[PDB]
Amino acid sequence: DLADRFAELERRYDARLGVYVPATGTTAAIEYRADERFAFCSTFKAPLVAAVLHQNPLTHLDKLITYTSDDIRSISPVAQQHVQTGMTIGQLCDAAIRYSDGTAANLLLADLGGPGGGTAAFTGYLRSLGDTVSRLDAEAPELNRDPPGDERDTTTPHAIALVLQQLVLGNALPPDKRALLTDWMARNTTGAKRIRAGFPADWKVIDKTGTGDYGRANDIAVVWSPTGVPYVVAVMSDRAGGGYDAEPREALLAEAATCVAGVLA
Ligand SMILES: *C(=O)[C@@H](NC(=O)Cc1cccs1)[C@@H]1NC(C(=O)O)=C(COC(C)=O)CS1
């Protein structure tokens, strides 16, 4: 029984686990704690890039953005290396998705603009996709740090799955922008030990991870069966019982995804 298996994983990892897979053709929705709030962590970067793409002509990707020492405030694998030269919006989108680059995400929030350094416009973009649940209140690093239970900077597995479904599978974006987002997620470098680890090699996986304090580890993905049937998979987790410095545990997400893949095969 799937709920029993997820509960077992919670005990194993001293964790809270949330899972959502939207209903399809012939599969019922898979849901476990799916309407409970979990921190976005870096998973917000996927709809953030969608927001920036949606808001601008495609060639806005070629605009150079400059930034300085005091902008580097978080893990930023790419932005730290290009600080002397600047990065185009396209490079920033690439880095935010594929390297979960915090500086890139903050610069993209600022590009979107408006109150809260772009966080209000980001939330407004989610509202436009019918998500009345999620909220972004802070940028990097702060957004990963809210105490367990705090609603700031949270989504739910259910809400983020429906958002990702519209972005990648639905018509939230025009085909050209949809393809840019899909390809960046397809080329993600940070997700090998999460949802990807739970699906057989002949299934395509594209994803965006998130990791935070209190043992937070998330992954949102679109997967395609060997025959081209797509599913959206959102797995979120925290280990609040270990306090702020609790280790995130990717293996929890890999096991949860393995359980999901078993049902979807
Ligand atoms: C987004 O989740 C962001 N997280 C943080 O900046 C907070 C943390 C820093 C170290 C551990 S949590 C970036 N994204 C990811 C990710 O998986 O998407 C990170 C993953 O790190 C580990 C550990 O697996 C950290 S940086």
mmCIF file of C-alpha atoms and ligand atoms in Angstrom:
data_model
loop_
_atom_site.group_PDB
_atom_site.id
_atom_site.type_symbol
_atom_site.label_atom_id
_atom_site.label_comp_id
_atom_site.label_asym_id
_atom_site.label_seq_id
_atom_site.Cartn_x
_atom_site.Cartn_y
_atom_site.Cartn_z
ATOM 1 C CA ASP A 1 0.000 0.000 0.000
ATOM 2 C CA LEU A 2 1.443 3.334 -1.174
ATOM 3 C CA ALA A 3 0.452 5.435 1.868
ATOM 4 C CA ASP A 4 1.945 2.756 4.119
ATOM 5 C CA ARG A 5 5.197 2.872 2.130
ATOM 6 C CA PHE A 6 5.411 6.669 2.396
ATOM 7 C CA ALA A 7 4.717 6.509 6.156
ATOM 8 C CA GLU A 8 7.516 3.921 6.457
ATOM 9 C CA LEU A 9 9.921 6.345 4.735
ATOM 10 C CA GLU A 10 8.909 9.126 7.102
ATOM 11 C CA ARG A 11 9.844 6.949 10.070
ATOM 12 C CA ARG A 12 13.110 5.820 8.413
ATOM 13 C CA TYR A 13 14.313 9.370 7.761
ATOM 14 C CA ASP A 14 12.611 11.071 10.742
ATOM 15 C CA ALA A 15 10.965 13.203 8.092
ATOM 16 C CA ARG A 16 7.769 14.751 6.842
ATOM 17 C CA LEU A 17 7.159 13.715 3.217
ATOM 18 C CA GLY A 18 4.758 15.166 0.655
ATOM 19 C CA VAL A 19 3.997 13.655 -2.736
ATOM 20 C CA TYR A 20 1.717 14.633 -5.612
ATOM 21 C CA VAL A 21 1.198 13.187 -9.076
ATOM 22 C CA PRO A 22 -1.800 14.704 -10.956
ATOM 23 C CA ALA A 23 -4.431 12.363 -12.385
ATOM 24 C CA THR A 24 -4.051 11.446 -16.055
ATOM 25 C CA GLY A 25 -5.787 9.411 -18.697
ATOM 26 C CA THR A 26 -6.063 6.222 -16.678
ATOM 27 C CA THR A 27 -4.128 6.905 -13.465
ATOM 28 C CA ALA A 28 -5.660 8.324 -10.308
ATOM 29 C CA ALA A 29 -3.828 11.178 -8.586
ATOM 30 C CA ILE A 30 -1.154 10.000 -6.159
ATOM 31 C CA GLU A 31 -1.283 12.115 -3.017
ATOM 32 C CA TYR A 32 0.429 11.994 0.355
ATOM 33 C CA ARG A 33 0.358 15.095 2.579
ATOM 34 C CA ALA A 34 -0.149 16.752 -0.796
ATOM 35 C CA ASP A 35 -2.015 19.794 0.560
ATOM 36 C CA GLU A 36 0.413 20.430 3.418
ATOM 37 C CA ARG A 37 2.734 23.419 3.040
ATOM 38 C CA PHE A 38 6.468 22.819 2.478
ATOM 39 C CA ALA A 39 9.163 25.431 1.773
ATOM 40 C CA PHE A 40 9.720 26.037 -1.978
ATOM 41 C CA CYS A 41 13.450 26.209 -1.497
ATOM 42 C CA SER A 42 15.021 26.408 -4.967
ATOM 43 C CA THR A 43 12.090 24.783 -6.703
ATOM 44 C CA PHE A 44 10.656 28.299 -7.238
ATOM 45 C CA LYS A 45 13.349 28.891 -9.858
ATOM 46 C CA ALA A 46 11.455 26.849 -12.456
ATOM 47 C CA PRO A 47 8.309 29.015 -12.444
ATOM 48 C CA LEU A 48 10.565 32.068 -11.966
ATOM 49 C CA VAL A 49 12.235 31.418 -15.334
ATOM 50 C CA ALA A 50 8.754 30.838 -16.826
ATOM 51 C CA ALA A 51 7.648 34.228 -15.437
ATOM 52 C CA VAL A 52 10.669 36.028 -16.953
ATOM 53 C CA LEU A 53 10.202 34.227 -20.285
ATOM 54 C CA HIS A 54 6.469 35.062 -20.323
ATOM 55 C CA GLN A 55 7.022 38.723 -19.455
ATOM 56 C CA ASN A 56 9.480 39.571 -22.250
ATOM 57 C CA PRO A 57 10.277 39.082 -25.930
ATOM 58 C CA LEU A 58 12.425 36.037 -26.478
ATOM 59 C CA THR A 59 15.451 38.186 -27.344
ATOM 60 C CA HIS A 60 15.405 39.650 -23.814
ATOM 61 C CA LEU A 61 17.527 36.488 -23.232
ATOM 62 C CA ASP A 62 20.384 38.364 -24.850
ATOM 63 C CA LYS A 63 20.363 41.330 -22.427
ATOM 64 C CA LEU A 64 23.563 41.532 -20.355
ATOM 65 C CA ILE A 65 23.096 41.886 -16.594
ATOM 66 C CA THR A 66 25.941 43.213 -14.441
ATOM 67 C CA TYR A 67 26.363 42.574 -10.738
ATOM 68 C CA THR A 68 28.948 42.973 -7.977
ATOM 69 C CA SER A 69 30.480 41.447 -4.823
ATOM 70 C CA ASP A 70 27.598 42.392 -2.565
ATOM 71 C CA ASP A 71 25.125 40.485 -4.828
ATOM 72 C CA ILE A 72 26.755 37.118 -4.031
ATOM 73 C CA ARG A 73 24.889 36.059 -0.883
ATOM 74 C CA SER A 74 24.147 32.346 -1.516
ATOM 75 C CA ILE A 75 25.347 29.205 -3.355
ATOM 76 C CA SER A 76 25.939 30.525 -6.883
ATOM 77 C CA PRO A 77 28.142 28.061 -8.839
ATOM 78 C CA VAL A 78 27.931 29.992 -12.104
ATOM 79 C CA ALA A 79 27.388 33.618 -11.032
ATOM 80 C CA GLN A 80 30.485 33.554 -8.786
ATOM 81 C CA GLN A 81 32.611 32.694 -11.912
ATOM 82 C CA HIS A 82 31.169 35.405 -14.173
ATOM 83 C CA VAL A 83 31.024 38.292 -11.734
ATOM 84 C CA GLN A 84 33.814 40.165 -13.584
ATOM 85 C CA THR A 85 31.947 40.084 -16.961
ATOM 86 C CA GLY A 86 28.197 39.953 -16.204
ATOM 87 C CA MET A 87 25.677 37.359 -17.424
ATOM 88 C CA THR A 88 22.912 37.541 -20.007
ATOM 89 C CA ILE A 89 19.324 36.857 -18.925
ATOM 90 C CA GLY A 90 19.625 33.550 -20.837
ATOM 91 C CA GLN A 91 22.763 32.634 -18.899
ATOM 92 C CA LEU A 92 20.971 33.560 -15.644
ATOM 93 C CA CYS A 93 17.974 31.356 -16.481
ATOM 94 C CA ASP A 94 20.375 28.508 -17.371
ATOM 95 C CA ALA A 95 22.288 28.872 -14.090
ATOM 96 C CA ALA A 96 19.157 29.302 -11.920
ATOM 97 C CA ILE A 97 17.676 26.071 -13.268
ATOM 98 C CA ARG A 98 20.682 23.824 -13.958
ATOM 99 C CA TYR A 99 22.975 24.831 -11.062
ATOM 100 C CA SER A 100 20.304 26.177 -8.708
ATOM 101 C CA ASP A 101 22.261 29.435 -8.712
ATOM 102 C CA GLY A 102 20.960 31.778 -5.966
ATOM 103 C CA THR A 103 22.483 34.971 -7.307
ATOM 104 C CA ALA A 104 21.050 34.191 -10.748
ATOM 105 C CA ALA A 105 17.618 33.706 -9.201
ATOM 106 C CA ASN A 106 17.869 36.958 -7.251
ATOM 107 C CA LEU A 107 18.863 38.837 -10.416
ATOM 108 C CA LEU A 108 15.929 37.292 -12.280
ATOM 109 C CA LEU A 109 13.577 38.333 -9.475
ATOM 110 C CA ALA A 110 14.925 41.891 -9.819
ATOM 111 C CA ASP A 111 14.396 41.662 -13.608
ATOM 112 C CA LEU A 112 10.751 40.720 -13.054
ATOM 113 C CA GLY A 113 10.676 43.750 -10.743
ATOM 114 C CA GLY A 114 8.030 45.317 -8.532
ATOM 115 C CA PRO A 115 7.597 45.182 -4.711
ATOM 116 C CA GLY A 116 9.605 42.778 -2.562
ATOM 117 C CA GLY A 117 12.475 42.721 -5.096
ATOM 118 C CA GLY A 118 10.313 40.731 -7.512
ATOM 119 C CA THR A 119 8.747 38.316 -4.993
ATOM 120 C CA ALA A 120 5.307 39.916 -5.277
ATOM 121 C CA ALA A 121 5.362 39.661 -9.121
ATOM 122 C CA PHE A 122 6.562 36.069 -8.847
ATOM 123 C CA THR A 123 3.629 35.236 -6.593
ATOM 124 C CA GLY A 124 1.301 37.096 -9.022
ATOM 125 C CA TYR A 125 2.554 34.903 -11.860
ATOM 126 C CA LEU A 126 1.555 31.782 -9.837
ATOM 127 C CA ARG A 127 -1.858 33.355 -9.148
ATOM 128 C CA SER A 128 -2.326 33.788 -12.934
ATOM 129 C CA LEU A 129 -1.923 30.014 -13.276
ATOM 130 C CA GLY A 130 -4.691 29.450 -10.693
ATOM 131 C CA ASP A 131 -2.381 28.722 -7.757
ATOM 132 C CA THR A 132 -4.018 30.476 -4.799
ATOM 133 C CA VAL A 133 -1.828 28.623 -2.284
ATOM 134 C CA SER A 134 1.871 29.299 -2.893
ATOM 135 C CA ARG A 135 3.752 32.392 -1.812
ATOM 136 C CA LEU A 136 7.270 33.775 -2.126
ATOM 137 C CA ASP A 137 8.277 36.385 0.458
ATOM 138 C CA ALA A 138 12.074 36.454 0.447
ATOM 139 C CA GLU A 139 14.882 35.888 -1.981
ATOM 140 C CA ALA A 140 18.064 33.830 -1.612
ATOM 141 C CA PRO A 141 19.365 32.965 1.067
ATOM 142 C CA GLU A 142 16.477 33.899 3.352
ATOM 143 C CA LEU A 143 13.759 31.912 1.593
ATOM 144 C CA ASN A 144 15.246 28.593 2.783
ATOM 145 C CA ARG A 145 15.276 29.563 6.473
ATOM 146 C CA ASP A 146 11.681 29.984 7.649
ATOM 147 C CA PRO A 147 10.872 27.947 10.757
ATOM 148 C CA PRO A 148 8.958 24.661 10.320
ATOM 149 C CA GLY A 149 5.226 25.447 9.977
ATOM 150 C CA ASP A 150 5.777 29.086 8.900
ATOM 151 C CA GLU A 151 3.795 29.827 5.724
ATOM 152 C CA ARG A 152 6.309 32.271 4.247
ATOM 153 C CA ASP A 153 8.031 30.979 1.085
ATOM 154 C CA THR A 154 5.845 27.850 0.868
ATOM 155 C CA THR A 155 4.001 25.845 -1.715
ATOM 156 C CA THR A 156 2.378 22.391 -1.538
ATOM 157 C CA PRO A 157 3.132 19.277 -3.573
ATOM 158 C CA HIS A 158 -0.370 19.604 -5.080
ATOM 159 C CA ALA A 159 -0.018 23.338 -5.960
ATOM 160 C CA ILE A 160 3.460 23.144 -7.476
ATOM 161 C CA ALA A 161 2.601 20.011 -9.477
ATOM 162 C CA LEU A 162 -0.367 21.788 -11.108
ATOM 163 C CA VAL A 163 1.844 24.801 -11.859
ATOM 164 C CA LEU A 164 4.566 22.642 -13.403
ATOM 165 C CA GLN A 165 1.971 20.717 -15.407
ATOM 166 C CA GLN A 166 0.725 23.957 -17.016
ATOM 167 C CA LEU A 167 4.263 25.203 -17.716
ATOM 168 C CA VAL A 168 5.700 22.056 -19.332
ATOM 169 C CA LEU A 169 2.679 20.090 -20.589
ATOM 170 C CA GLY A 170 -0.007 22.767 -20.895
ATOM 171 C CA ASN A 171 -0.251 26.116 -22.641
ATOM 172 C CA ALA A 172 0.954 28.581 -19.977
ATOM 173 C CA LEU A 173 3.855 29.463 -22.290
ATOM 174 C CA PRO A 174 4.049 29.692 -26.095
ATOM 175 C CA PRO A 175 5.815 26.684 -27.605
ATOM 176 C CA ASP A 176 9.156 28.446 -28.076
ATOM 177 C CA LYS A 177 9.383 29.625 -24.480
ATOM 178 C CA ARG A 178 7.989 26.298 -23.230
ATOM 179 C CA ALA A 179 10.811 24.536 -25.062
ATOM 180 C CA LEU A 180 13.477 26.771 -23.448
ATOM 181 C CA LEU A 181 12.167 25.988 -19.962
ATOM 182 C CA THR A 182 11.817 22.264 -20.717
ATOM 183 C CA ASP A 183 15.356 21.987 -22.094
ATOM 184 C CA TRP A 184 16.911 23.750 -19.111
ATOM 185 C CA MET A 185 15.109 21.371 -16.742
ATOM 186 C CA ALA A 186 16.119 18.475 -19.014
ATOM 187 C CA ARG A 187 19.756 19.461 -18.604
ATOM 188 C CA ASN A 188 19.618 19.980 -14.868
ATOM 189 C CA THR A 189 22.831 18.957 -13.080
ATOM 190 C CA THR A 190 21.542 18.764 -9.501
ATOM 191 C CA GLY A 191 18.882 16.057 -9.605
ATOM 192 C CA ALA A 192 20.609 12.713 -10.279
ATOM 193 C CA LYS A 193 19.973 11.377 -6.761
ATOM 194 C CA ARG A 194 16.321 12.423 -6.456
ATOM 195 C CA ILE A 195 13.346 11.712 -8.738
ATOM 196 C CA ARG A 196 15.761 10.629 -11.504
ATOM 197 C CA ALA A 197 17.131 7.901 -9.205
ATOM 198 C CA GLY A 198 13.621 6.401 -8.772
ATOM 199 C CA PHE A 199 12.716 6.027 -12.475
ATOM 200 C CA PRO A 200 14.169 3.487 -14.919
ATOM 201 C CA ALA A 201 16.716 4.755 -17.451
ATOM 202 C CA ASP A 202 14.272 4.474 -20.367
ATOM 203 C CA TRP A 203 11.997 7.073 -18.761
ATOM 204 C CA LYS A 204 12.904 10.701 -19.582
ATOM 205 C CA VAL A 205 13.178 12.940 -16.503
ATOM 206 C CA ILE A 206 13.399 16.725 -16.334
ATOM 207 C CA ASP A 207 13.506 18.415 -12.915
ATOM 208 C CA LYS A 208 14.268 21.268 -10.553
ATOM 209 C CA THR A 209 15.518 20.512 -7.041
ATOM 210 C CA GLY A 210 15.325 22.444 -3.781
ATOM 211 C CA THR A 211 17.347 22.069 -0.590
ATOM 212 C CA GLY A 212 17.115 24.108 2.610
ATOM 213 C CA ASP A 213 17.505 24.281 6.353
ATOM 214 C CA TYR A 214 15.651 21.954 8.737
ATOM 215 C CA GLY A 215 16.611 19.033 6.466
ATOM 216 C CA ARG A 216 14.549 20.343 3.524
ATOM 217 C CA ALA A 217 14.907 18.417 0.275
ATOM 218 C CA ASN A 218 12.501 18.752 -2.672
ATOM 219 C CA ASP A 219 12.336 17.825 -6.327
ATOM 220 C CA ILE A 220 9.715 18.681 -8.959
ATOM 221 C CA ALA A 221 9.800 16.782 -12.255
ATOM 222 C CA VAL A 222 8.056 15.922 -15.449
ATOM 223 C CA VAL A 223 8.694 12.321 -16.480
ATOM 224 C CA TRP A 224 7.875 10.529 -19.725
ATOM 225 C CA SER A 225 7.326 6.823 -20.088
ATOM 226 C CA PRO A 226 9.163 4.878 -22.813
ATOM 227 C CA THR A 227 5.980 5.341 -24.913
ATOM 228 C CA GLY A 228 5.750 9.090 -24.400
ATOM 229 C CA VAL A 229 3.093 9.290 -21.670
ATOM 230 C CA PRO A 230 3.937 12.213 -19.350
ATOM 231 C CA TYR A 231 3.416 12.516 -15.583
ATOM 232 C CA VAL A 232 4.238 15.346 -13.192
ATOM 233 C CA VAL A 233 5.914 14.295 -9.930
ATOM 234 C CA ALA A 234 6.354 16.630 -6.924
ATOM 235 C CA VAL A 235 8.173 15.304 -3.874
ATOM 236 C CA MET A 236 8.870 17.533 -0.872
ATOM 237 C CA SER A 237 10.434 16.790 2.489
ATOM 238 C CA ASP A 238 11.723 18.216 5.748
ATOM 239 C CA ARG A 239 13.317 16.854 8.919
ATOM 240 C CA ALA A 240 12.258 19.530 11.412
ATOM 241 C CA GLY A 241 12.944 17.113 14.270
ATOM 242 C CA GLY A 242 16.689 17.695 13.778
ATOM 243 C CA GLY A 243 16.380 21.482 13.992
ATOM 244 C CA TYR A 244 17.959 24.086 11.707
ATOM 245 C CA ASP A 245 21.058 22.060 10.882
ATOM 246 C CA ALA A 246 19.190 18.791 10.134
ATOM 247 C CA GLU A 247 20.804 17.136 7.108
ATOM 248 C CA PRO A 248 18.663 17.056 3.939
ATOM 249 C CA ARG A 249 18.328 13.436 2.796
ATOM 250 C CA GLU A 250 18.128 12.919 -0.972
ATOM 251 C CA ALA A 251 17.687 9.182 -0.517
ATOM 252 C CA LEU A 252 14.218 9.854 0.923
ATOM 253 C CA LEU A 253 13.203 11.429 -2.389
ATOM 254 C CA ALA A 254 14.840 8.629 -4.436
ATOM 255 C CA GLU A 255 12.899 5.991 -2.439
ATOM 256 C CA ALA A 256 9.656 7.960 -2.668
ATOM 257 C CA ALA A 257 10.135 8.283 -6.446
ATOM 258 C CA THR A 258 10.884 4.544 -6.742
ATOM 259 C CA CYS A 259 7.546 3.861 -5.061
ATOM 260 C CA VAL A 260 5.796 6.254 -7.449
ATOM 261 C CA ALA A 261 7.540 4.742 -10.526
ATOM 262 C CA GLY A 262 6.338 1.280 -9.420
ATOM 263 C CA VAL A 263 2.721 2.465 -9.640
ATOM 264 C CA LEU A 264 3.178 4.370 -12.911
ATOM 265 C CA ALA A 265 4.922 1.486 -14.781
HETATM 266 C C1 LIG B 1 17.886 26.206 -3.466
HETATM 267 O O1 LIG B 1 17.251 25.118 -2.860
HETATM 268 C C2 LIG B 1 19.291 26.479 -2.968
HETATM 269 N N1 LIG B 1 19.381 26.141 -1.537
HETATM 270 C C3 LIG B 1 20.076 26.928 -0.712
HETATM 271 O O2 LIG B 1 20.685 27.938 -1.082
HETATM 272 C C4 LIG B 1 20.059 26.514 0.763
HETATM 273 C C5 LIG B 1 21.038 25.364 0.979
HETATM 274 C C6 LIG B 1 22.368 25.335 0.824
HETATM 275 C C7 LIG B 1 22.953 24.139 1.095
HETATM 276 C C8 LIG B 1 22.119 23.163 1.480
HETATM 277 S S1 LIG B 1 20.554 23.842 1.481
HETATM 278 C C9 LIG B 1 20.276 25.796 -3.949
HETATM 279 N N2 LIG B 1 19.740 24.512 -4.420
HETATM 280 C C10 LIG B 1 20.096 23.258 -4.096
HETATM 281 C C11 LIG B 1 19.257 22.239 -4.837
HETATM 282 O O3 LIG B 1 19.382 21.032 -4.612
HETATM 283 O O4 LIG B 1 18.470 22.712 -5.664
HETATM 284 C C12 LIG B 1 21.098 22.929 -3.173
HETATM 285 C C13 LIG B 1 21.438 21.448 -2.835
HETATM 286 O O5 LIG B 1 22.412 21.151 -1.896
HETATM 287 C C14 LIG B 1 22.551 19.895 -1.320
HETATM 288 C C15 LIG B 1 23.236 19.808 0.053
HETATM 289 O O6 LIG B 1 22.167 18.854 -1.869
HETATM 290 C C16 LIG B 1 21.868 24.008 -2.406
HETATM 291 S S2 LIG B 1 21.949 25.602 -3.303
#
